[PDB]
Amino acid sequence: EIKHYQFNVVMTCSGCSGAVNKVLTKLEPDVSKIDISLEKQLVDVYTTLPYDFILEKIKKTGKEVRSGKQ
Amino acid sequence: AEIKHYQFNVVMTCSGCSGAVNKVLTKLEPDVSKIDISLEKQLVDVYTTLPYDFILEKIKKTGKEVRSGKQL
Amino acid sequence: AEIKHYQFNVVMTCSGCSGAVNKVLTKLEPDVSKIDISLEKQLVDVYTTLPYDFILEKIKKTGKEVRSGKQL
Ligand SMILES: [Cu+2]
Ligand SMILES: [Cu+2]
Ligand SMILES: [Cu+2]
Ligand SMILES: [Cu+2]
């Protein structure tokens, strides 16, 4: 069953937000929906996959993850 | 009253880096009378009545590394 | 004589990051004869007489992460 996670990630330019998009996009179709706002610095993910698995994938980009939740 | 001149050597690699610093500083008008950011020289010059530390902390909320700062 | 070819996987996120890498390596001309940088593939190709670990260090100094490096 599809779960919903939201991370608060420090993204400064459109390259930062693109980099996060990129790694989530590789997880399609297990990620069914991606929604990112540079300006509010938020990342929303709809997937079947574990929080912990998505937390790591996103930090791998080297962008600071301030906070998470489900 | 007195306008202080501060310089920061801030790690800034694209114009997002430098724009994010810019944005936090412009928020502090009317107490900032001049902001000179040079993305090319990785320098941030601020003229302001505010104390150094308060300015420093506003810059660091961007997440960009501040290599050094000084009051001129 | 040898003109050596090095390839590094470097975490370049926007064209500021790749441009930061390009600038450190163009400061090494003409010892560096050719530079091909691929933002897309995250790769930096250097043709040079300088030794491998000297080029590696220069790229590290930019602060962008180097995942891997090799001589071909
Ligand atoms: Cu950028
Ligand atoms: Cu960026
Ligand atoms: Cu940047
Ligand atoms: Cu960048």
From Swiss-Prot, chain A:
Keyword terms, alphabetized: Chaperone, Copper, Copper transport, Cytoplasm, Ion transport, Metal-binding, Transport
PROSITE patterns: HMA_1 (PS01047), HMA_2 (PS50846)
Cell compartments where the protein resides: Cytoplasm
Record's note on what induces expression: Expression is induced by oxygen. Expression is also induced by the iron-sensing trans-activator AFT1.
Function as written in the Swiss-Prot or TrEMBL entry: Copper homeostasis factor that specifically transports copper to the secretory pathway for incorporation into copper enzymes destined for the cell surface or extracellular milieu. Shuttles copper to the transport ATPase CCC2 on a post-Golgi vesicle for eventual targeting to the cell-surface high-affinity iron uptake protein FET3. Protects against oxygen toxicity.
Summary of subunit composition and partner proteins: Homodimer. Interacts with CCC2 via the copper anion.
Entry similarity comment: Belongs to the ATX1 family.
Protein's name according to its UniProt entry: Copper chaperone ATX1
Lineage of producing organism: Eukaryota, Fungi, Dikarya, Ascomycota, Saccharomycotina
Gene name linked to the record: ATX1
